[PDB]
Symmetry: C2
């Protein structure tokens, strides 16, 4: 199902041009506050699928109050997902539909626009430094955080024995270790998201946030391993699929 | 979905009629052997269901070598449900299909006939002392063991505070405590089947086996919490449904 190389080459070019717009520092007052005072609304996006369907998916956007993490907005919608999944090109599959949900939120409940969006996928921890979380952030201009559930093995990062030893060393929720690429760059952080979970999240900057702020906020959104905004978008979009054929 | 009383009466009557044929002692030479020397084939049966379907189910019979617990025979087939689930009458929902699978095995691989069958459900630990594991045992005349994953609250048995304290007292795989009826009789055993599980199994005699033999064999079949013959029939019958729906 993989697109031809000329197509991937065009997509690489687009990623490299948009990357110039990524802001990888704090631009919002709440981000420099020790307790995120001023942060009121946190967004989460995800896309679920039907096992049989190569065409149909369900895209969900949720907004949660902060710090209580209660759902104040949900839009789950069937969409005609086209492009296949190709590692490093996730945005070309999911991000056009996620942009449409943000625009629907602006049109329907503009006062509930999230101040930051947690994205199910990497940001700058990416083959070309421009993952789905950056891509969504640049297209919507919202602050975004990339949260991935396994390690993207790029710029020398490997899920080898040493990497797994560092995971064992993470002992409680909040513990972290930096992901340092062969380039000298800190690409992201491995984060132990709560006390009763050993498999880390991999957190990276999407847009308009610093890495250390992205980690700390992500930690604060974790009732469970998956940060509550992504988890609710994940749960609600699968439930929606289940309600309509299943 | 509940059947009329006349159907239930006929079912109670059928259970009381077959109960007279239950043999609750060891009748097989391997059963008195300290290591079950001579036991070579252990059977397992289960039926899986479709969430939407009131009609379609998938019944599975597996036979495993002993002591290696490798599957040497599998028969999984889709069937037409004829009766709904009513507690205390499980056999009238599932056991006609299991009997047919046993007869198909006799026709196809008679040398792989199991020497004992582990059944997903109670034996004599039952509202009328004749549960699905006895019912299968009498209809096929094979030795059967009842293995249930929850406690059937009958004859004064309750999943109360005292009961849950005794479960805490089970510390390792093989630990057990007896399930005593109000009459003082031992209906079955609670068994901790695995070191790395806390939730016990409830083991009772089906047919042609004693309780202590049934408990010890059940333990020896447990690679995980669920004894490997029932576990394999469960996995394979669910896989069949999943692939066809
Ligand atoms: Mn606040
Ligand atoms: Mn996702
Ligand atoms: Mn999933
Ligand atoms: Mn998901
Ligand atoms: Mn052998
Ligand atoms: Mn069953
Ligand atoms: Mn089940
Ligand atoms: Mn089952």
């Amino acid at each position: 199902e993989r697109p031809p190389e000329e197509t991937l080459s065009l997509w690489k070019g687009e990623q490299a041009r948009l990357k110039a717009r990524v802001v990888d520092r704090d631009t919002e007052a709440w981000q420099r506050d020790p307790s995120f005072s001023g942060l009121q609304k946190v967004g989460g996006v995800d896309v679920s699928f039907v096992k049989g369907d190569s065409v149909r998916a369900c895209a969900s956007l949720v907004v949660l109050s902060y710090p209580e993490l209660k759902v104040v907005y949900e839009d789950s919608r069937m969409v005609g997902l086209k492009a296949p999944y190709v590692s490093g090109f996730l945005a070309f599959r999911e991000v056009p539909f996620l942009v449409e949900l943000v625009q629907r939120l602006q049109e329907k409940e503009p006062d509930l626009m999230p101040q930051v969006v947690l994205v199910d996928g990497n940001g700058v921890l990416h083959q070309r430094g421009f993952g789905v979380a950056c891509h969504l952030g640049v297209l919507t201009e919202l602050p975004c955080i990339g949260v991935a559930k396994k390690l993207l093995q790029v710029d020398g990062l490997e899920n080898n024995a040493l990497h797994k030893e560092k995971i064992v060393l993470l002992q409680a929720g909040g513990d972290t270790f930096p992901l340092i690429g062969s380039s000298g760059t800190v690409l992201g952080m491995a984060l132990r998201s709560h006390d009763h979970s050993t498999k880390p999240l991999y957190v990276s900057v999407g847009h308009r946030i610093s890495l250390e702020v992205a980690v700390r906020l992500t930690h604060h959104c974790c009732r469970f391993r998956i940060p509550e905004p992504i988890r609710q978008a994940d749960i609600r979009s699968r439930e929606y699929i289940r309600r309509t054929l299943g």
